[PDB]
Amino acid sequence: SHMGVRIENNLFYVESKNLSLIIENRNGYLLLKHLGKTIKNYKGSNSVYERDHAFSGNPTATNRTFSLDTQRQIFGQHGLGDFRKPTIQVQHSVTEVTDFRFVEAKILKGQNGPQGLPSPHSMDDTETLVLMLEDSKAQLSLTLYYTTFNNDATIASYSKLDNNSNQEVVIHKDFSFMADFPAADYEIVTLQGAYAREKTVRRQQVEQGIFSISSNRGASGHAQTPALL
Amino acid sequence: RNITKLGNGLTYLETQMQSHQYMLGLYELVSYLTEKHSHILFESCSGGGGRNDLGMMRYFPQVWASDNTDAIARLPIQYGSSYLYPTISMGAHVSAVPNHQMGRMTPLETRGLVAMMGNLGYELDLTNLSDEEKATIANQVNLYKELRPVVQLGQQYRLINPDTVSNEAAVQFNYGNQTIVTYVRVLSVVETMETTLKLKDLDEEGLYKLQENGEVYSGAELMYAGLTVILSQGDFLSRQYIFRKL
Amino acid sequence: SHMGVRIENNLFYVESKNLSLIIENRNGYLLLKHLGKTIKNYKGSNSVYERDHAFSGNPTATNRTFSLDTQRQIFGQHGLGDFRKPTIQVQHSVTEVTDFRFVEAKILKGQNGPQGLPSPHSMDDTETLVLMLEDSKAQLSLTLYYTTFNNDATIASYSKLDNNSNQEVVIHKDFSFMADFPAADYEIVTLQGAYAREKTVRRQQVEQGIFSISSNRGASGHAQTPALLLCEQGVTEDAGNVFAIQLMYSGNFEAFVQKNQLNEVRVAIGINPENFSWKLAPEEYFETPVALVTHSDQGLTGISHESQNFVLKHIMLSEFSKKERPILINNWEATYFDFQREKLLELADEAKKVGIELFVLDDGWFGNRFDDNRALGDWVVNEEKLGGSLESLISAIHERGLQFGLWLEPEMISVDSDLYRQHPDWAIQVPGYEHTYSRNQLVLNLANPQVVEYLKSVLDQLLFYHDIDYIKWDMNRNITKLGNGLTYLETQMQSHQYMLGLYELVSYLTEKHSHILFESCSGGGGRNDLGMMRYFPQVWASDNTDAIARLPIQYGSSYLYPTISMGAHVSAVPNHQMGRMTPLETRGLVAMMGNLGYELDLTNLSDEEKATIANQVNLYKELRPVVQLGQQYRLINPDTVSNEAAVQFNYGNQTIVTYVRVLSVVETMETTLKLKDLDEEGLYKLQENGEVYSGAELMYAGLTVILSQGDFLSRQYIFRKL
Amino acid sequence: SHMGVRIENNLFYVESKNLSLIIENRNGYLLLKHLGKTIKNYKGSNSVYERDHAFSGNPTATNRTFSLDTQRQIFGQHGLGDFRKPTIQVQHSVTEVTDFRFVEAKILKGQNGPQGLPSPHSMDDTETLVLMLEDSKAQLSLTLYYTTFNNDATIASYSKLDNNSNQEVVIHKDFSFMADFPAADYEIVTLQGAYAREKTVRRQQVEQGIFSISSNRGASGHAQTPALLLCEQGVTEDAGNVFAIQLMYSGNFEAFVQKNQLNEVRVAIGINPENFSWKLAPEEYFETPVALVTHSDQGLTGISHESQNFVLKHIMLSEFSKKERPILINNWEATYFDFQREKLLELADEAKKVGIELFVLDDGWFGNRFDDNRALGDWVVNEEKLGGSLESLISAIHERGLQFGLWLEPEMISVDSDLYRQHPDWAIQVPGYEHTYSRNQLVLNLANPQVVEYLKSVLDQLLFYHDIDYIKWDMNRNITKLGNGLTYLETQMQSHQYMLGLYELVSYLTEKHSHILFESCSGGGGRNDLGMMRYFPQVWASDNTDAIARLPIQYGSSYLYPTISMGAHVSAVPNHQMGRMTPLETRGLVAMMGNLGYELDLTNLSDEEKATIANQVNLYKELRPVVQLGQQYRLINPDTVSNEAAVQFNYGNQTIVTYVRVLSVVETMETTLKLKDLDEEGLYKLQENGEVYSGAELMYAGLTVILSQGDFLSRQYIFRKL
């Protein structure tokens, strides 16, 4: 099977036509190893080199070289030492610290998507990687889905958050996709503009700090398109 | 319009959910209706392109790309509107002059050619047109009936981008044995050598017959040497090259 | 009154030296009419033209041309039709829609600021515009303050939010300053970087969308400074308009620039929304940190001067802002944790021989601190290690002619400490989660009033019972695992309450001991902001003490802050961070562009190197007034691409210029280096060659800069005006 | 004496207002020590450091550190070790190696310049440095002249080469000015473009290698102007150092910038080496055209002002340089060749009704000139076509209240002409080659003294026998087929001798008839240079009379030259060059940023359009002093990318601003347009709304610029200072 989903030891391969996402399970932490052109029998030539980075904190007292501040990931939390913008953030009890750990992976075939939201069709020749994460103390489940397409260089993603606790919890952030890319020179292309000037193509250099486009208008809007290249 | 004054929840938390719940409500409504009436073509709109995204395009196979129907103002808009989305989605209409948004006169030929890089319609009072202009519209409609498969079903190649600084736009479509190229120039120029416009993704050995002059060019010539693009003096002029692969 | 506050019909004029903010009251809505150079009898040549803009909504049904989406404002709300990023957002009842309307203005004279947060001093010649806004339905008051300065092109701002309702309300966003600027081409300059690369100067074009810098680390951080300069296109060192917005705050901040659908530009700075919510019970209020807006039309040098001057006169403590700082030795890189009494006194001996003035005892003197894995929180003198009482060590040092200095890290607690053993709940933590460690230590919850009380007591004891002349106040990790509140809301307040606790602690201690020089630190420049510089007249600018790596760091570290603040130390080679050999001459000259100290084992130096150090110390004693008290002019900037750095200082009859070249070059014509801000007719005598040059020659022709072959060479030109 | 020439030991000081050239004599070699702002008691802070540079050779065997490859100079030779482009090169005997050594300096006061070439006037308060150089072996003298101006930051230069030997020698290169500038980052600005696109402003980085602009067309040309601005990196309209080098010459020129192996930069301007050689028999001499070096430290506006001022005071004829120019009508675009007496007088009638002051009869009145295929050379009045004598037409026009103007093209000859029939050898041609035609006409050989004598005679006759108030002097092709010499060398001299012939002719005629306004022309701006502007106080800036196409053209055409020079005419729509409709308002406002005339058939206008023209003429009569006599400030530049143009003029109590927008925009915030160089405290009353704005408001806040929907809209703001 040139395309679909594969689980090989601690590596998950999500393989669309000419596009792979390779994820490593590292003791419950999910690392983005590669996103790009197809690689089989991936060894880790481009692994993050684990160094002590100043002010990049650690899950254990005695290992200073492992930090979620410096590992490349597929979802982002706040309060565990990673200080990059988070993509999942849930209030429960007196905190909005979660610590979702990978517990189990499954593979689906065919039609799959969130209920009540628009999602891909013609999914007969797709497979979906199901990555099941839990925060045992908060009694929450986060499930990540990645879907291959056999006829396009696209992968689709979404998540499900389950409350398995005895109390109300509140989601504050829940993005649909995140990727950490290696330090290199990049440009971004977006479609912005205005009423009577829609989808103006903008290109710029990536700079230190944060660039964003967003809508708070309750529709995507004339001035920004949900896209980033 | 956009959403203001969020406060319909029984609690603050319910208000904070209101905006996403609005969306779920829309999607329930439109998935229900497009499903129960799948034979109807639904075109999405929001003061033109106010909500032109892949959420809506799951249900609405076409969108009104912009209320700006100016042939020239449309160039950067169509550039963007088809950047990630297929041309078939991209509503584009020939409208009256002076244009209502821009205050500008444009050749009916150019309004025609620009709208035909999209999903063609008309938005003007046909009853107030001269006999000539009516005849022009009928010819445009005859042309597009021919061009429609190439434009709506074919592969789009941007050749010159109408960006902030460019004085030009050119887009090519390939579809089996058919290749079309539209060229628009915004401002008139003088003592400036003609543009050379090279086509993309042809067979080098292919023989391409240009309709206007009957000449047969190999794909290699069209791709590697290109077309000397010729125009009279004037603003907002356009032309189209149509090729049949023999 | 050329300067101060004026209220003329529906216009408010906030008038500092060469900088005005002109606000119009429009039926309860406040419009930003002008921010920039002084205008009297303002008419409105630059008013927003009121048009119907598609999808820009309206307060009334029948007027489509008035929209808070299109008006330029001084504060931003969401839900009233303005869709630009908001700067005030308050949850009350079932909504976080407010609608604050102007009701009344007042003018204050003199001293004024938020309680419990750092704010300007020397305010006798200031006035403050008080703009009182109310949301009558929510029963909330928002009061905006703008303060003039008669001697600087700066305006200061902050706000107070009062809850006058019968229910709890929650603040979600409350920035300290916002301005809507007209559509034009702009660039922004910020100071970013990293640990061992602090305050890297970044310049970029303003683009449609939103750009921001922010900290969510519970300190301002190494990687971003609370500053944002909105510049006219093509600004240079010498020319162009610059507006610097800055925040006197050391916690989580955000600065942003938004270019909206119409090409308009919003800038704001304040407490980061991330990690922040603020509960107000009835009658309670909230005041934001002070923001500053500073203006120059003399380019990037002009904004440097404006910002430095303001800091020197109105932020940095009066007791130190014009006081020459002692040349110190610090044992840290010199011995790490491995020292005892004999070694210290031996170092002190050598320090005295070379004319060093102050001796700083760094990490490792307290509790069980033999490494960096324990003992934080136990501020109990290790008499075994110091070979007796700290009292007797200090006297030993005083007697050898040196002032005495000491390193602390009050905000931190090791798991392996008596403190953590007595009070594990004092650490910032979440119930039922393991700690996140950083340098194998935890952060004390300074939101806990018992933690603040304990630190006051322990440190007051330390400072009262010992003849300490100098404190280095360090802080070596960022805040993780927020969950010490009794409710979620209390946790969300924890980060700002931590800051209030710090400020209460350090304002108390610096006040009760004003004779001691306090130097701030956070793994070097991890918290180098105007919050800290209200209390600590000096900062350890970077742990990177490489002479070459220092160039871009000092460029940034003195960009908006005075040179006097900027700790810089000659260290050993090969350099411990960079792995590099540099000339002792260059380490000398680079550190002397800052506040000079030494951080190397003087006892292990050759007789030559000792002699070199003594000469360097003799040179700096001469240079100190010019460098620390004089005017700084950047001549060549050590940026990403440059192979060079040059900085000039003028001070009365004295002019100095330091030149550094990073990589050796060959078959390359010598640089020509022109000086700035001299008298054309002035006669300047160059020390090295005795030659006398007019200022015009030095400014308009410049110096052919000559160097041998080699990396990292430097030279200094010293001039006396005759 | 703050200004003039000084000789102090081995230093020569050439001191204009705010601009000095300091030259050192070093054992016969002349070194450029400084060019820039005034320095007295120069010591040499910026001297070249003398090093052994590989492959940089030496005049003596034993000193490797002195090389003319590495010294900064004011003239350049080849073969002595300097490998940068040379500016003097003379063949004598078997070599073109010279070695000119300084022997002696003199100082002149007052009037001074090359014979038979255009040069500065009003020279009472000038001094000239005379640097006498000799090559003793070749028996040649080279004399360099540098002239100060007491009222402008400009220096003028030229040279004289004397042959003192017993043999013929040949000049191959002889530029008018050269300067070696120190290695630094530079940009250059030039005026290039094309026919119907004249003087396009180009800016680029200086790069290693050689950049040049040049003409080999026998006129300066549409596509390049004899100008080159060497600018400091990042120069703006308002700030930065600029050096403009310019040439008072209308023939073949070259300007170059060379960045050599060491990063050094040479600039030069002069007669193009291409199409040039100059034979000197014993005792004969050659003098080069005048070059100008002009300096500002106030950016691109500052260099504009410096250049315009100098042109107005020292180049443009005194009789006209401050004289308001008549508003004219020209029949060219209006009727082409197809006119007769009735039509002319009818046009004249209409021109008078709308208040036009001067009537210009264009091409087609002479010999057999019914089209552009014949008759050039036959300057004989076609009385049939003019319905009688030219005398009677002129009186007809004088009587209707209008001045009278006439088009000529003296330098040209048609194959089909009585002239070509009597004298085919007077055309520039090569024996045994067919003509190269251009607009089906040939160029008269003005190197032939019989051609010059004939043109003097024919034109003196024309001007003495007719009451002509204005001449348009056209020139509609470039020079091809050089071969009229009796030897190759005489052919190589033909192009410069043509120019000397032109200058003899036009200086003679403008002098013998100084009351007539002469406007120069060459298919519009084909020869718009400072050579021509010595004799012709006005020029037809471009045949492109499109209001929008004109914007970049007027930007360029007034960049270094005063607005008063810049002919601009309201023409018909659709425009004949561009094929475009433009508002008559915009054609009006654009032409009024220049020297206003009309070029359309007034008899075919509606009553409305006639009324509009009369209002425009009334407006300009008011605006004329401000535009023609006042100070110009560019506010928004019509460059390649801009959608806008704005220019301001100040003149005593009057300030005007014109704004044009090219393409209509939507959902775009209005431009904010700030004025320059007002009194902050000044009160400025805007005519349209009656409102009074302080200068500070207009400069620091600016105008919200409002427009309807549509292309090519314009507006004007008029202010009176109270």
Short mmCIF file of N, CA, C and O in Angstrom, two decimals, chain A residues 91 115-121 168 170 172 189 191 195-201 216-223 225-229, chain B residues 2-3 13 20 22-24 27-28 46-55 58-59 65-68 76-77 79-81 83-85:
data_model
loop_
_atom_site.label_atom_id
_atom_site.label_comp_id
_atom_site.label_asym_id
_atom_site.label_seq_id
_atom_site.Cartn_x
_atom_site.Cartn_y
_atom_site.Cartn_z
N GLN A 91 -10.09 24.80 30.40
CA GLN A 91 -10.30 25.09 31.81
C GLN A 91 -11.03 23.92 32.46
O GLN A 91 -12.06 23.48 31.96
N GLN A 115 -19.29 15.83 13.23
CA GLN A 115 -20.74 15.93 13.07
C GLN A 115 -21.13 17.41 13.00
O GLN A 115 -20.69 18.20 13.83
N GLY A 116 -21.93 17.78 11.99
CA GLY A 116 -22.59 19.08 11.94
C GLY A 116 -21.70 20.19 11.37
O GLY A 116 -22.10 21.35 11.40
N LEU A 117 -20.52 19.83 10.86
CA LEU A 117 -19.58 20.74 10.22
C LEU A 117 -19.23 20.23 8.82
O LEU A 117 -19.18 19.03 8.62
N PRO A 118 -18.94 21.09 7.81
CA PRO A 118 -18.65 20.60 6.46
C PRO A 118 -17.34 19.81 6.40
O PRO A 118 -16.35 20.21 7.01
N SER A 119 -17.33 18.68 5.68
CA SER A 119 -16.11 17.88 5.63
C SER A 119 -16.00 17.17 4.29
O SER A 119 -16.96 17.16 3.52
N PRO A 120 -14.81 16.62 3.94
CA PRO A 120 -14.62 16.00 2.62
C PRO A 120 -15.61 14.89 2.26
O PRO A 120 -16.11 14.15 3.11
N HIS A 121 -15.89 14.75 0.97
CA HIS A 121 -16.71 13.63 0.51
C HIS A 121 -15.87 12.78 -0.44
O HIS A 121 -14.70 13.06 -0.66
N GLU A 168 -18.21 20.28 34.92
CA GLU A 168 -18.18 21.09 33.71
C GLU A 168 -16.73 21.51 33.42
O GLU A 168 -15.98 21.84 34.34
N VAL A 170 -14.40 23.89 30.28
CA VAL A 170 -14.59 24.93 29.28
C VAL A 170 -13.40 24.96 28.32
O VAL A 170 -12.28 25.20 28.74
N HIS A 172 -11.22 26.87 25.69
CA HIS A 172 -10.86 28.25 25.39
C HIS A 172 -10.17 28.36 24.01
O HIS A 172 -10.42 29.32 23.29
N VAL A 189 2.17 33.44 1.91
CA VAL A 189 1.18 33.99 1.01
C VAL A 189 -0.19 33.82 1.66
O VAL A 189 -0.51 32.71 2.12
N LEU A 191 -4.54 35.51 1.36
CA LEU A 191 -5.55 36.22 0.60
C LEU A 191 -6.32 37.08 1.61
O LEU A 191 -6.97 36.58 2.53
N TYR A 195 -13.94 44.53 1.14
CA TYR A 195 -15.12 44.59 0.29
C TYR A 195 -14.74 45.32 -1.00
O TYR A 195 -14.08 46.35 -0.94
N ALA A 196 -15.18 44.77 -2.14
CA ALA A 196 -14.93 45.28 -3.49
C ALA A 196 -13.45 45.17 -3.87
O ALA A 196 -13.07 45.68 -4.92
N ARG A 197 -12.66 44.45 -3.04
CA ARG A 197 -11.25 44.15 -3.28
C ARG A 197 -10.88 42.76 -2.72
O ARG A 197 -9.81 42.61 -2.14
N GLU A 198 -11.73 41.75 -2.91
CA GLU A 198 -11.63 40.50 -2.15
C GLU A 198 -10.38 39.74 -2.55
O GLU A 198 -9.91 39.87 -3.68
N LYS A 199 -9.82 38.99 -1.59
CA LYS A 199 -8.83 37.95 -1.83
C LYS A 199 -7.56 38.56 -2.43
O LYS A 199 -6.94 37.96 -3.31
N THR A 200 -7.16 39.75 -1.96
CA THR A 200 -5.93 40.33 -2.47
C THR A 200 -4.76 39.48 -2.03
O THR A 200 -4.58 39.23 -0.84
N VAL A 201 -3.94 39.07 -3.00
CA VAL A 201 -2.84 38.16 -2.75
C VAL A 201 -1.74 38.96 -2.06
O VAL A 201 -1.28 39.97 -2.58
N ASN A 216 -13.27 38.19 13.41
CA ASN A 216 -14.10 38.22 14.61
C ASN A 216 -15.48 38.76 14.22
O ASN A 216 -16.20 39.31 15.06
N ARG A 217 -15.85 38.59 12.94
CA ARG A 217 -17.07 39.17 12.38
C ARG A 217 -18.22 38.16 12.35
O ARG A 217 -19.34 38.50 11.97
N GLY A 218 -17.93 36.91 12.74
CA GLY A 218 -18.95 35.87 12.79
C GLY A 218 -19.20 35.23 11.42
O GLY A 218 -20.00 34.30 11.31
N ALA A 219 -18.50 35.78 10.40
CA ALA A 219 -18.24 35.19 9.09
C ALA A 219 -16.74 35.32 8.79
O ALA A 219 -16.10 36.26 9.24
N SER A 220 -16.20 34.44 7.93
CA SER A 220 -14.80 34.51 7.53
C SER A 220 -14.40 35.90 7.04
O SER A 220 -13.34 36.40 7.42
N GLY A 221 -15.24 36.54 6.21
CA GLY A 221 -15.06 37.95 5.92
C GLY A 221 -14.45 38.24 4.55
O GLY A 221 -13.78 37.39 3.96
N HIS A 222 -14.64 39.48 4.08
CA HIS A 222 -14.06 39.98 2.84
C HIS A 222 -12.54 40.16 2.91
O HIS A 222 -11.88 40.12 1.87
N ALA A 223 -12.01 40.40 4.12
CA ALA A 223 -10.67 40.95 4.30
C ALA A 223 -9.66 39.87 4.63
O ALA A 223 -8.47 40.15 4.70
N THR A 225 -9.18 35.31 4.10
CA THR A 225 -9.61 33.98 3.70
C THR A 225 -8.98 32.96 4.65
O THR A 225 -7.84 33.16 5.08
N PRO A 226 -9.68 31.88 5.06
CA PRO A 226 -9.08 30.87 5.94
C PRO A 226 -8.01 30.05 5.20
O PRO A 226 -8.22 28.90 4.83
N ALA A 227 -6.84 30.68 5.01
CA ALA A 227 -5.77 30.08 4.24
C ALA A 227 -4.45 30.70 4.65
O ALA A 227 -4.37 31.91 4.93
N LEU A 228 -3.40 29.87 4.63
CA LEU A 228 -2.06 30.38 4.84
C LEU A 228 -1.06 29.44 4.16
O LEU A 228 -1.03 28.25 4.44
N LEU A 229 -0.24 30.01 3.26
CA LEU A 229 0.74 29.25 2.50
C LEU A 229 2.11 29.55 3.07
O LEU A 229 2.52 30.71 3.05
N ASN B 2 -22.21 41.91 9.32
CA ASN B 2 -21.47 41.08 10.26
C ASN B 2 -22.16 41.11 11.63
O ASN B 2 -23.08 41.90 11.87
N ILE B 3 -21.73 40.20 12.52
CA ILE B 3 -22.42 39.99 13.78
C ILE B 3 -21.87 40.94 14.85
O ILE B 3 -20.66 41.00 15.07
N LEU B 13 -21.23 32.07 29.39
CA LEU B 13 -20.69 30.95 28.62
C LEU B 13 -21.55 30.62 27.40
O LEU B 13 -21.01 30.27 26.36
N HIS B 20 -20.22 30.12 17.40
CA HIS B 20 -20.01 28.84 16.76
C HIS B 20 -21.34 28.10 16.56
O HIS B 20 -21.53 27.44 15.54
N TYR B 22 -24.17 29.57 16.01
CA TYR B 22 -24.73 30.20 14.83
C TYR B 22 -24.28 29.42 13.59
O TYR B 22 -25.10 29.09 12.73
N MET B 23 -22.98 29.12 13.51
CA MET B 23 -22.42 28.45 12.36
C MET B 23 -23.01 27.04 12.19
O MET B 23 -23.38 26.66 11.08
N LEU B 24 -23.10 26.28 13.30
CA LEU B 24 -23.68 24.94 13.29
C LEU B 24 -25.12 24.98 12.77
O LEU B 24 -25.55 24.10 12.02
N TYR B 27 -25.05 25.60 9.01
CA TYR B 27 -24.66 24.38 8.31
C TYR B 27 -25.77 23.33 8.34
O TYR B 27 -25.95 22.60 7.37
N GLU B 28 -26.48 23.23 9.45
CA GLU B 28 -27.63 22.34 9.56
C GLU B 28 -28.69 22.78 8.55
O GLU B 28 -29.30 21.97 7.86
N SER B 46 -22.14 37.08 0.05
CA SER B 46 -22.13 37.90 1.25
C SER B 46 -21.59 39.27 0.88
O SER B 46 -20.40 39.52 1.01
N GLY B 47 -22.47 40.14 0.36
CA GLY B 47 -22.00 41.36 -0.27
C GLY B 47 -20.84 41.06 -1.23
O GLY B 47 -19.77 41.66 -1.13
N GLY B 48 -21.08 40.10 -2.13
CA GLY B 48 -20.03 39.49 -2.91
C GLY B 48 -19.26 38.45 -2.09
O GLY B 48 -19.86 37.49 -1.59
N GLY B 49 -17.95 38.68 -1.92
CA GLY B 49 -17.01 37.66 -1.46
C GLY B 49 -16.76 37.73 0.05
O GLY B 49 -15.67 37.35 0.51
N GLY B 50 -17.78 38.16 0.80
CA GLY B 50 -17.67 38.31 2.25
C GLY B 50 -17.61 37.01 3.05
O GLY B 50 -17.38 37.04 4.26
N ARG B 51 -17.81 35.85 2.40
CA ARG B 51 -17.79 34.56 3.10
C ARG B 51 -17.43 33.47 2.09
O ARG B 51 -18.07 32.43 2.00
N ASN B 52 -16.41 33.76 1.28
CA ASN B 52 -16.00 32.84 0.24
C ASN B 52 -14.93 31.91 0.81
O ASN B 52 -13.74 32.20 0.72
N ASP B 53 -15.35 30.78 1.40
CA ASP B 53 -14.41 29.88 2.05
C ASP B 53 -14.85 28.45 1.74
O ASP B 53 -15.86 28.26 1.08
N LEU B 54 -14.06 27.47 2.20
CA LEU B 54 -14.29 26.06 1.90
C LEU B 54 -15.41 25.46 2.76
O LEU B 54 -15.91 24.38 2.45
N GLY B 55 -15.80 26.16 3.84
CA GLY B 55 -17.01 25.80 4.56
C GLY B 55 -18.23 25.90 3.65
O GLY B 55 -18.98 24.93 3.49
N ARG B 58 -18.57 23.58 0.40
CA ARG B 58 -19.08 22.23 0.57
C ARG B 58 -20.55 22.12 0.15
O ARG B 58 -20.98 21.03 -0.21
N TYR B 59 -21.29 23.24 0.17
CA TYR B 59 -22.73 23.21 -0.04
C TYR B 59 -23.16 24.01 -1.27
O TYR B 59 -24.20 23.73 -1.86
N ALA B 65 -18.21 36.33 -6.42
CA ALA B 65 -16.85 36.55 -5.96
C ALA B 65 -16.63 37.98 -5.44
O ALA B 65 -15.79 38.17 -4.56
N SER B 66 -17.42 38.94 -5.96
CA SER B 66 -17.29 40.34 -5.57
C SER B 66 -18.44 41.18 -6.13
O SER B 66 -18.86 40.94 -7.27
N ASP B 67 -18.92 42.15 -5.34
CA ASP B 67 -19.88 43.15 -5.81
C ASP B 67 -19.21 44.11 -6.81
O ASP B 67 -19.89 44.86 -7.49
N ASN B 68 -17.87 44.12 -6.84
CA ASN B 68 -17.14 44.96 -7.79
C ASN B 68 -17.14 44.24 -9.13
O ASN B 68 -16.43 43.24 -9.29
N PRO B 76 -7.38 41.74 -10.08
CA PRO B 76 -6.78 41.27 -8.83
C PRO B 76 -7.74 40.42 -8.00
O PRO B 76 -7.30 39.59 -7.20
N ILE B 77 -9.04 40.62 -8.22
CA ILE B 77 -10.03 39.91 -7.42
C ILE B 77 -10.14 38.47 -7.89
O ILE B 77 -10.34 37.58 -7.06
N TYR B 79 -7.78 36.92 -9.58
CA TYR B 79 -6.47 36.37 -9.26
C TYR B 79 -6.57 35.67 -7.91
O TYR B 79 -6.29 34.48 -7.78
N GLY B 80 -7.06 36.41 -6.91
CA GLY B 80 -7.21 35.86 -5.57
C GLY B 80 -8.30 34.79 -5.47
O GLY B 80 -8.12 33.78 -4.78
N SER B 81 -9.42 35.00 -6.16
CA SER B 81 -10.63 34.23 -5.91
C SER B 81 -10.48 32.83 -6.49
O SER B 81 -11.16 31.89 -6.07
N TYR B 83 -7.34 31.46 -6.57
CA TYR B 83 -5.97 31.10 -6.22
C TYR B 83 -5.93 29.69 -5.65
O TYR B 83 -5.03 28.91 -5.95
N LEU B 84 -6.89 29.39 -4.79
CA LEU B 84 -6.93 28.09 -4.14
C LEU B 84 -8.22 27.36 -4.52
O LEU B 84 -8.32 26.15 -4.30
N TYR B 85 -9.17 28.10 -5.12
CA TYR B 85 -10.51 27.60 -5.45
C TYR B 85 -10.66 27.49 -6.96
O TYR B 85 -10.13 28.31 -7.71
#
